[PDB]
């Protein structure tokens, strides 16, 4: 299935899809899947295109997730092959999007096609979730598609996000979760003998010692303990006595705590120190974790039996859309090609590796459903 | 001398000298003082025009101090006489700066002149120290004059600051004390959980913001600390993000000194093993003028002229007194009713301006002979 995958990857790479502009990538994918019996559901929002393509109508629902947008190229004269030509030189496919993530998007799509072709009455649902904006703002992409599925109680049981997850050798890492991120924007008002203890900056300092020493949880098997960072402290313009003290703090949290628990505990500490304040919360993502089980064995065993390596399961890896998908109760894992050339001049990926990815994604489906 | 004082006050009131812009006020003062035997020395810095004028060479040096700047007028609709027209109506001079403090500036000026004309061989030195920014940022005014004087070891023995001191009746109050001003600029560096520099720096901040420096005394209210700046982290265009910067000011009474403040701050930092640098800026020292030559000279001057005894008070309104006390001068302040200052329809009694002129003159006669 190598050449089918490479062939699709080149069609996609030749469409310059700088976020959020899809440049027809999703439409050629749709056209193609439509002819093979997939139901095609378009979920554009503002300037972003999203696609939800399904074969089958029941649980378990296995989605392959990914994105067709790429980051900008830089000056194209720094490139050895032109970035949107999709040349193959000596078994390597060059192009912007080759590694992140048009190659593996193609691998996943071709895996899905060959499976449903060989198994037209498979149980469950094989689906593709594709956004045109993961790399930029990412407000109107996967989250919009997720919110839409959720508003009508449609399920995803399992999800494989094909971001390039491999560090040193193909297959060496699979991501099975990520810590949550929440940010507090805190504004202490009225900061100007007798009653020195009642100064709001003093009460703020007391709160801060408590906030920086509070142990939220003890982490667990899969995550270090929840960490709090003071990002910024700001009062004063650099000369005029300031009316407010601004404190910004971020928690990177694990599954032992929720955001509601963090918000209610911070509120509690502020009340306990009798502070008057305003706070604005920014939730970037809730934590997700796929524990060893069906999904993680299916991909782990797929890698071992395809390329003879045992991947390490890892949490972290920076931003994907996995954190959004996990909100609907889907179990999320991520796996794809080497990530060493992503976002750089001369981004490229092994034609051989793309083939192997195709076979790994296909074998995951066999392990999950056969 | 009422008419010379009123006339000079009007010439100043008409110049819209919004801080720090002198609008030629000091030049008109310099011109007349120069026509008598005064040495004129300008000490401009940045946007502010300073003026140090003296007659004589021997100590004691007696400095009259004040400012030519005024706070903004507000909407000129609400004045019943335009804020810079300097109109006299039913015995009142109306204008921005009538009360604070061009009226008393004029009175101290005419008093200094009259004394000098009548006593060319007087002992001591009679000086004027005038700035065009007391009311706003006040970084390049009196502070700059005192820096310059102190650098060349020039002394002021006595100082009368002409801020309007009277509360209800002309002469009912003389200010004999002010708190000092020191500013600390602190850079805490490098910013299992109780050992993080942020935690330790929060403990320090706790301390700094409730440590009771003193409870004041018989003559003063308590020393106060206020934070002007706290910055840490990458946000807000911070160019030293890995430092916790705290700038804070102490307005301090005689119960403590600059040395106790610095030592104590250093001690608190040490207790937390914080790596830090600190720069201190002492701009003003506290003063309390006790009974004696200076305080008697003005108390008696007011008793002589109007038949009232001033009570001695600390604080109230603002002045450059503490900036002058930094150099070891003894300081008192006296002037007109202050109830219209910084307000619409600021004004001042012209008879009070005359009386002020007499009082300042009598004070010179009392101090010298
Ligand atoms: Zn990327
Ligand atoms: Zn990506
Ligand atoms: Zn004043
Ligand atoms: Zn004033």
| Interchain pair B238, A245: CB under 8 A | no
Per-residue tokens: A237: 């313009």
Beta bridge partners of B347: B94
Which of A23, A113, A133, A134 is labelled catalytic? A134
In order of A45, A131, A145, B249, B298, the CA distances from A152 in angstroms are: 17, 19, 11, 60, 88
Kindly state the helix (H) or strand (E) to which residue B52 belongs, with its residue range: strand B51-55
The residue among A251, A286, A321 that closes a domain is A286
Angle at B367 between CA B130 and CA B40, to 5 degrees: 30
DSSP helix/strand/coil, B277: strand
Chosen domain end from A268, A286, A304: A286
Expt. technique: X-ray
Structure-token pair, residue B247: 């700038």
Closest Cα of chain B to A182: distance in Å? 17
Sequence-separated (6 or more) residues with CB below 8 Å from residue B186: B245, B246, B247, B248, B265, B276, B277, B278
Dihedral sign for Cα atoms in the order B41, B45, B50, B56: negative
Q: CA-to-CA distance for A29 and A8, rounded, in angstroms?
A: 9
Could you give the CA distance from residue B189 to residue B245 in angstroms, rounded to a whole number? 9
Quickly tell me which residue has 């003093």 as its tokens: A202
| Strands A173-178 and A288-289, bridge-based pairing | antiparallel
The domain spanning residue B320 has which CATH number? 3.40.630.10
- The structure tokens listed for A86 are 């999709």
Contact (CB, 8 A) for B99 and B166: no
Query: Phi and psi at residue B19, in whole multiples of 5°?
Result: -55, 135
d(CA A342, CA B316): 67
Tell whether residue B304 is among the known ligand binding residues: no
Instruction: Kindly state the tokens that stand for B58.
Output: 């021997």
- Residue A328 in contact with residue A75, Cβ under 8 Å? no
Distance CA B57, CA B124 (A): 6
For testing contact with chain A, the best of B186, B230, B235, B243 (most A CBs within 10 A): B230
User: How many Cβ pairs closer than 8 A exist between chain A and B?
Assistant: 94
Query: Is A231 within 8 Å of A248 (Cβ atoms)?
Result: yes
Q: What is the CATH number of the domain that holds B243?
A: 3.30.70.360
Run of H or E residues at B188: strand B180-189
CB within 8 Å of A137: residues ≥ 6 apart: A19, A20
What phi, psi does A261 have (nearest 5°)? -70, -45
Domain count, chain A: 2
Which pair of structure tokens corresponds to residue A135?
């790399």
Catalytic residues of B: 69, 134
One domain for residues B30 and B152: yes
Among the listed residues A335, A358, A368, the one whose alpha carbon sits nearest the alpha carbon of residue A109 = A358
In this structure, are B278 and B300 located in the same domain? no
Chain A hits for B137, CB-CB cut-off 8 Å, are 239
- Cβ burial A134-169 (10 Å sphere, 16+ → b, else e): bbbebebbbbbbbeebeeeeeebbbbbbbbbbbeee
Could you tell me which of B10, B191, B34 has the C-alpha nearest to residue B106? B10
Q: Beta partners for A181?
A: A252, A285
Q: How far is A230 from chain B (nearest CA, A)?
A: 8
Q: Judge if A248 and A334 occupy the same domain.
A: no
The whole-angstrom separation of Cα B103 and Cα A164 is: 80
- Which residue, among A210, A209, A104, has the nearest Cα to A163 in the 3D structure? A104
B35/B171 same-domain check: yes
Establish whether A133 is a catalytic residue: no
- Please list, residue by residue across A218-249, b when 16 or more beta carbons sit within 10 angstroms of its beta carbon and e when fewer do: ebeebbeebebebbbbbbbeeeeebebbbbbb
Sequence-distant (6+) residues with CB within 8 A of B255 are: B213, B214, B215, B216, B217, B220, B223
Known binder of ligand: residue B67?
A: yes
Picking from B285, B319, B351, the residue at the C-terminal end of a domain is B285
Residues A76 and A343: their CA atoms lie apart, in Å, by 13
* Test the A interface: residue of B221, B233, B272 with most A CBs within 10 Å: B233
A77 and A150 part of one domain: yes
CB contact under 8 Å between A196 and B215, yes or no, is no
Closest CA to B243 of B202, B209, B184, B197: B197
Q: Cα(A47)–Cα(B85) distance, rounded to whole angstroms?
A: 63
Q: What are phi and psi of B288, to 5 degrees?
A: -140, 110
Contact A196 B202 (CB under 8 A): no
Backbone angles phi, psi at B15, to 5 degrees: -80, 120
Residue B326 neighbours by CB under 8 Å, 6+ apart: B146, B150, B180, B282, B283, B284, B285
Cα dist from A264 to A252, A258, A269, A368, B8, whole Å: 16, 10, 9, 40, 67
Distance CA A368, CA B254 (A): 82
Q: What's the token pair of residue B290?
A: 């006790």
Task: Mark whether A143 and A68 lie in a shared domain.
Answer: yes
Same domain, B89 and B112: yes
| Strand ordering across the sheet containing B347-349 | B88-89, B92-94, B347-349
Helix axes A294-307, A351-369, angle to 10 degrees: 140
Query: Are the C-beta atoms of A177 and A244 separated by less than 8 Å?
Result: no
Rounded Cα gap, residues B263 and B284, in angstroms: 18
Residue B181: its H or E element: strand B180-189
CB B309 within 8 A of CB B359: no
From residue A97, alpha-carbon distances to A105, A354, B166 in Å are 10, 13, 80
Residue A75 annotated as catalytic? no
DSSP lists the bridge partners of residue A18 as A70
Q: Which 3 state secondary structure label does DSSP give B287?
A: strand
Question: First vs last Cα of chain B: how many Å apart?
Answer: 20
Helices first, then strands: H and E counts in chain B: 9, 16
Say if residues A349 and A103 touch (Cβ distance below 8 Å): yes
Boundaries of domain holding B141 = 1-178+286-369
If asked whether residues A270 and A220 sit together in one domain, one would say yes
Residues B192 and B314 in one domain: no
Residue with tokens 């955001």: A259
Q: B70 CA to middle of ligand 4, Å?
A: 7
CB B65 within 8 A of CB B149: no
- Strand order of the sheet with strand A348-350? A88-89, A92-94, A348-350
Question: Alpha carbon of A76 to those of A70, A81, A83, A346: distances in Å?
Answer: 15, 9, 7, 10
**How far does the centroid of ligand 2 lie from the alpha carbon of residue A68, in Å?**
8
On whether both B25 and B132 belong to a single domain, the answer is: yes
SS3 B51: strand
Resolution in A: 2.3
Q: At CB < 8 Å, which residues of chain B contact A? A: 137, 193-194, 196, 198-199, 202-203, 205-206, 209-216, 222-224, 226-236, 238, 244, 247
DSSP 3-state of B205 = helix
Does a cis peptide bond (omega within 30 degrees of 0) precede residue A72? no
Q: How far is the CA of A17 from the centre of ligand 1 (A)?
A: 12
Q: How far apart are CA A38 and CA A130, in angstroms?
A: 14
3-state SS class at B346: coil
**Which residue blocks in chain A are alpha helix, DSSP H?**
2-13, 25-34, 103-118, 142-151, 200-213, 259-272, 294-307, 322-325, 351-369
First to last CA, chain A: 20
Do the bridges between strand A50-55 and strand A125-131 make them parallel or antiparallel, or are there none, so unpaired? antiparallel
Instruction: Provide the Cα torsion B20, B21, B24, B25; round to 10°.
Output: -40
- Of all ligands present, the nearest one to the C-alpha of B346 is 4
B279 and B296 assigned to the same domain: no
Residue B243 CA to residue B98 CA, distance in Å, equals 47
Q: Where are the alpha helices (DSSP H) in chain B?
A: 2-13, 25-35, 103-118, 142-151, 197-208, 258-270, 293-306, 321-325, 350-367
**B51: nearest Cα among B133, B121, B115, B159:** B133
Residues A216 and A170 both lie in one domain? no
Hunting for tokens 């009082």 — which residue is that?
A: B359
Max CA pair span of chain A: 83
Separation of CA A350 from chain center = 23
Task: In whole angstroms, give the CA distance from residue A343 to residue A210.
Answer: 41
Q: What is the b/e burial string over B303-332, where b = at least 16 CB atoms within 10 angstroms of the residue's CB?
A: bebbeeebebbbeeeebbbbbbbbbebbbb
Burial B205-226 (b: 16+ CB within 10 A, else e): bbbbbbeebbebeebbebbebb
Residues after which chain A is broken (C–N above 2.5 A) are: 192, 239
Token representation of residue B127: 């000086």
Distance from CA of A139 to the nearest CA of B (A): 23
C-beta atoms surrounding B195 within 10 Å:
8
Cβ separation B199–A205 shorter than 8 A? no
**Residue A333: closest CA among A302, A355, A308, A305:** A302
Cα of A23 vs centre of ligand 2, distance in Å, is 17
- Discontinuities in chain B with C to N beyond 2.5 Å fall right after 191
**A339 CA distance to ligand 4 middle (Å):** 67
Reduced to 3 states (helix: H, G, I; strand: E, B; else coil), residue B131 is strand
């Amino acid at each position: 299935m190598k050449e089918k995958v490479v062939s699709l990857a080149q069609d996609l790479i030749r469409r310059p899809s700088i976020s959020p502009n899809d440049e027809g990538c999703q439409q050629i994918i749709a056209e193609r899947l439509e002819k093979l019996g997939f139901q095609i559901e378009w979920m554009p929002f503002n300037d972003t295109l999203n696609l939800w393509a399904k074969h089958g109508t029941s649980e378990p629902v296995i989605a392959f997730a990914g994105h067709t947008d790429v980051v900008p190229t830089g000056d194209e004269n720094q490139w050895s092959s032109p970035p949107f030509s999709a040349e193959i030189i000596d078994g390597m496919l060059y192009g912007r999007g080759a590694a992140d993530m048009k190659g593996s998007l193609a691998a996943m799509i071709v895996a899905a096609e060959e499976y449903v072709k060989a198994n037209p009455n498979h149980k469950g649902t094989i689906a593709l979730l594709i956004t045109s904006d993961e790399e930029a703002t990412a407000k109107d992409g996967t989250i919009h598609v997720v919110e839409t599925l959720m508003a009508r109680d449609e399920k995803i049981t399992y999800c494989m996000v094909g971001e390039p997850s491999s560090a040193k050798n193909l297959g060496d890492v699979v991501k099975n979760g990520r810590r949550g991120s929440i940010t507090g924007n805190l504004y202490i008002q009225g900061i100007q003998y007798p009653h020195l203890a009642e100064n709001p900056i003093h009460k703020a300092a007391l709160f801060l010692q408590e906030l920086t020493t509070y142990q939220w949880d003890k982490g667990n098997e899969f995550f270090p303990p929840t960490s709090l960072q003071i990002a910024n402290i700001h009062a004063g313009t650099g000369s005029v006595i300031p009316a407010e003290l601004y404190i910004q703090f971020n928690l990177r949290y694990c599954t032992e705590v929720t955001d509601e628990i963090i918000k209610q505990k911070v509120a509690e500490m502020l009340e306990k120190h009798n502070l008057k304040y305003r706070i604005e919360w920014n939730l970037s993502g809730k934590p997700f974790l796929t524990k060893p089980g069906k999904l993680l064995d299916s991909i782990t065993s797929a890698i071992e039996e395809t390329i003879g390596i045992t991947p390490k399961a890892e949490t972290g890896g920076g931003t994907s859309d996995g954190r959004f998908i996990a909100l609907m109760g889907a179990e999320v894992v991520e796996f794809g090609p080497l990530n060493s050339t992503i976002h750089k001049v001369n981004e490229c990926v092994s034609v051989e590796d793309l083939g192997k990815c195709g076979e790994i994604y296909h074998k995951m489906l066999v392990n999950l459903l056969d």
